[PDB]
Symmetry: D4
Subunit: 138 residues, 8 copies
């Protein structure tokens, strides 16, 4: 039969990046935020004019990784460090980043995409990404 | 800004698998050595089957056609005809490195939503299209 | 050899964000499913918004148009017309893998300096250009 | 003179991926399985609609690696860990993955391709890949 | 589903080596600076020899021709002629990034099975084809 | 098989530097915003200078022209003219991803040996060629 | 309103690479020096005819990395080694190099690009890059 | 003035690969040997029909690395291991491999290219590469 599941909308992606960039302004950070769809393809990007261009790749990779692994990128890093996850996870996919700041996006229990932030270093990247995610509480 | 949760059909792995299986059966019965590729709605592979006597280029050909049909929401043969009749600019060829405007890609539609694409390469022209259409039949 | 420090306008993240927001609003009001991309003057993305019903190719299409307009300092539609009228050699198509000579990219200018480019894909031809122009209006 | 060797057929590749996806259903995992030919080029791929897109790369890389190295990817990982294999093996080829789940395919003592599975983590990836391989017992 | 074990000829490293050696000898005797490339049936290199006075582009040219001939199972010159006479759509050019539809690639056949391809670049047109054919002679 | 040691001229870093310096001086005096690129005989960069008002595409344009001229051992403008007059097949465009058959690349020759290539982009057509030629003058 | 900031000029990039190559001559090293703009795109490259072609990539990556991270590449290496920076910083961007020899270029307190040197190994690469940077004192 | 230096000829590259493949036959190994020019661009490749396709990349990367670094790839590996070479050398260039089997080619004291072998594992790769190099004694 035909399976129906939530799909992450352009409007939802836009709302997330807008909130993240507002918070990044407030905290004085120069970042990029990226939201990807279920299959890792971009729905939204916003970059600050003082954010280095690496933050485009950092944020995309984190979003992609979280969307595909269905776990926060920080958790994967923690898992390699404590020996529970093989370190070769790093090389599984050229779009992988295990730096903190990627979070999976779930709607009605289905993974529908990912959000990633780069430019503020790990802790703040994670804090900002979470603020984006929380726009979609349901 | 965010709006409501939107739910849409999803092309399942089982559906993609059934499509490639029926296409390969028809290709063998018809005398063609092909690759058939099914992609999701974002152009990412769900299924590939290649005949060992199909050239490796058919991996690229079938993928590109499937990608193109999914993204353009049109059959690749229709785009080819639009380029020829001047209704579509020829520079469409260079818009995306995964584009192929050769016959054999068809969008996959469930409940009026484009959920993916199917592409076939190796059967030359019209037979790639016929084979791709065979794949769609398994969803009916 | 080095000369003096030169200061020029910078397209801000806020400006790029405002541009993509207004373009997406207009696209939805107009009946188009698009991606809009804004790049800095070196062709590196500042902002992207994509409609979930816009094909993934529109990511590439909009980026390429934005890149092309920023680098060439001309609207992509003007380049397309120059190729057609013979004033621009067709091999311009192959000069850079990020080039698209299809309508919908426009340079972004502040205080007479090209500071970036905007590109739109998914609305077919003239509407991509109209939408890109809407983005420029937010800077005025 | 002219050397003749087995060649992995499309039918064989198809049979392997079908069995793997059946078993993955039964075990409740969302994976991709990929089979490659002797020269690392795809013959078959099947992905579950809940499997992240990284599993395309993971499964391909594992299949490619096993086909070219003529050993299971898990064995290479084990060998780096115990110091018998130099760690720079990781960077020899951009298609390499030393994550468990790639197995070489042998017919009549000749390496004819590789099978790889990604999406279930190492142990289950290996279990699933083996089920695929066993279709070709002779 | 799996069927029987199928055995086919394999182009050996010794055969590929002999082919490139004879082609380079003929090229030097003929006044050409070339690269000759032999690929296996999946388009992966078995042998390359380049003259130090052959431009590096001849690495790409010879590889692409060898790949194309192996995958298409036809001489690249035959494909070029089909594009010109309208029997082959020109978009074949974009189906695979390793395609070259310029003369100089020929499929390698052993016991009626395509086992690889040979390509030559640097001798311009018909001489690339003649040189590629010289390589085939060593298998007889 | 190996033969004798062969010695040939080498384009030095100092020579490549002098070439790009003189080209940039002439470009500024002439009213052009360009990139000039010099490559070694294997197509690998020795020198690049870009004007901050030259679009980033000129990095690719100048490199491709320099590469093409070094590898083909001909001026890119001569290749462009050969395509137009039918003496060179148009598929030369797809032989190598670093090819540009637009005017502005010239081979660099020392003691009758091609030792590299120079390419210029950003000055449109004939001025790219004139600027590239200025670079050659510093070797005399 | 409209923000105005310094932009690294072609003339400035040229002056930097000329000075670096003069010093490299004097010290007997075969290097490449690369200068990139604010967004990591090349403004200048000079390579010695005895410098290996890897120095093109080395110098570019170092320049890019320094421009985007706003810190010297040597500092990032030091930070991974002492545990203050997560090692996965290495994989954030395919243009990253944490080898010594990249330095950010600042004009009037704004990061406007990066300079990188490769071919002399770390210490000398750093020394040469600094000589380039010092051309722009203000 | 005009500098003249040796250039590695096609004939020299051919002679090297022929000797290596003869020795590989004799030793029962399935390898690829690659010779690159001064700027890392291929002059010769020979692969055995039982050598995995990764050996194309392995041999090229080793040849490229040795040509550009002007030292054997085994030496670089040794140097990272003993702490004399920073480990980030691995990421300087996408064509780098620090696996044993790459050797620089020198003519009249000038580095003119590199030879690399892959498929026999490190020690034998190095032994085979050396046999190739020795064709050019002068």
């Amino acid at each position: 039969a035909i399976v129906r599941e939530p799909v992450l909308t352009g409007e939802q992606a836009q709302a997330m990046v807008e909130v993240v960039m507002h918070e990044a302004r407030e905290s004085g950070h120069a970042v990029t935020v990226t939201v990807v769809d279920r299959s890792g393809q971009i729905l939204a990007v916003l970059r600050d004019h003082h954010a280095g261009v690496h933050t485009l790749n950092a944020s995309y990779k984190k979003a992609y990784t979280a969307a595909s692994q269905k776990r926060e990128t920080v958790a994967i890093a923690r898992g390699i460090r404590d020996g529970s996850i093989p370190s070769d996870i790093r090389y599984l996919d050229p779009n992988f980043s295990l730096m903190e700041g990627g979070i999976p996006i779930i709607l009605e229990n289905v993974v529908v995409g990912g959000i990633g932030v780069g430019g503020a270093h790990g802790s703040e990247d994670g804090r900002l990404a979470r603020i984006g995610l929380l726009v979609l509480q349901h």
